[PDB]
Amino acid sequence: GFTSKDTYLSHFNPRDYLEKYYKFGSAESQILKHLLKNLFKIFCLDGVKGDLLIDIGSGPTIYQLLSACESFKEIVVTDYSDQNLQELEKWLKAAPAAFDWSPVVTYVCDLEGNRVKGPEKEEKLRQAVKQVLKCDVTQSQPLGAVPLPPADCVLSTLCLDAACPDLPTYCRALRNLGSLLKPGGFLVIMDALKSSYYMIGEQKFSSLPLGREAVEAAVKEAGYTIEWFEVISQSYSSTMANNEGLFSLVARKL
Ligand SMILES: Nc1ncnc2c1ncn2[C@@H]1O[C@H](CSCC[C@H](N)C(=O)O)[C@@H](O)[C@H]1O
Numbered sequence: 056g057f058t059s060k061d062t063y064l065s066h067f068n069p070r071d072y073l074e075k076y077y078k079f080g081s082a083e084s085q086i087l088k089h090l091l092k093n094l095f096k097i098f099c100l101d102g103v104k105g106d107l108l109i110d111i112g113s114g115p116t117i118y119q120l121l122s123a124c125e126s127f128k129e130i131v132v133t134d135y136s137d138q139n140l141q142e143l144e145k146w147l148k149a150a151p152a153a154f155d156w157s158p159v160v161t162y163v164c165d166l167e168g169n170r171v172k173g174p175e176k177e178e179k180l181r182q183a184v185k186q187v188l189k190c191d192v193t194q195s196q197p198l199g200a201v202p203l204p205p206a207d208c209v210l211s212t213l214c215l216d217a218a219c220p221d222l223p224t225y226c227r228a229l230r231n232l233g234s235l236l237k238p239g240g241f242l243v244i245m246d247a248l249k250s251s252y253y254m255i256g257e258q259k260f261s262s263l264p265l266g267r268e269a270v271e272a273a274v275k276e277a278g279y280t281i282e283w284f285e286v287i288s289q290s291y292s293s294t295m296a297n298n299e300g301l302f303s304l305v306a307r308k309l
């Protein structure tokens with residue numbers, strides 16, 4: 056009774072997803088602001104840095120990487136959907152048909168103290184992203200046959216509830232992402248709480264409805280130690296999903 060992963064290849068419209076959730080012109084904008092403040096805190100205020108960050112289930116979005124590119128030499132973006140990766144690549148290659156992230160970029164520049172302007176920030180992100188890869192979090196080797204050095208950080212925003220049909224798969228996915236991480240490496244997860252679906256227009260997608268206790272327990276079971284865990288009550292618009300807030304966590308691999 057859960058969305059099949061092949062539905063992501065064919066029925067997840069990347070430009071419609073961006074239009075629906077990331078236009079930043081709403082509950083969606085309030086959530087985006089909070090996600091950005093947390094990412095800024097992690098990568099710029101806390102010591103989350105290194106040579107390599109792997110972003111898991113990036114979809115067609117870059118917002119989750121804007122603060123990260125200040126702290127990581129290389130960012131690898133990954134997703135199950137080739138269509139999502141193509142939409143991402145349109146922005147990376149600064150193509151005229153690319154999504155306009157400029158209000159989000161400006162917001163991050165403001166958070167970071169206006170040290171740089173939008174164009175410099177976008178260029179820094181474009182230079183950090185060297186690889187755009189296929190991933191499947193449900194597999195023991197999420198990146199398949201593709202070899203990568205162990206990462207300093209694995210980040211995943213709004214992916215794991217959508218990718219995991221049940222709690223045992225969710226715990227296994229956390230172990231699978233851990234295989235990409237160096238010992239003592241950072242795991243950064245942000246996702247919806249108690250959400251059983253989300254919509255992109257008329258297209259419905261399943262979500263695993265987890266509470267904060269189940270998320271914490273799965274992260275400890277998967278071999279991590281939690282540094283901090285935050286719950287926000289703000290939910291997406293009623294037309295989009297049925298979540299009861301969002302969580303953010305930073306953990307280290309044992
Ligand atoms: N098994 C799986 N492994 C990896 N990615 C998967 C997956 N099942 C679904 N996904 C991806 O999970 C994403 C959910 S959308 C979240 C996109 C983005 N990180 C954001 O913050 O908005 C989609 O891009 C979808 O292709």
Ligand SMILES: CNc1cc(C)c(C(N)=O)c[n+]1C
Nearest residue numbers: 213216247250252253262296
């Ligand atoms: C904004 N993107 C969202 C939003 C929600 C609420 C869910 C979910 N897990 O229900 C998944 N995605 C990918």
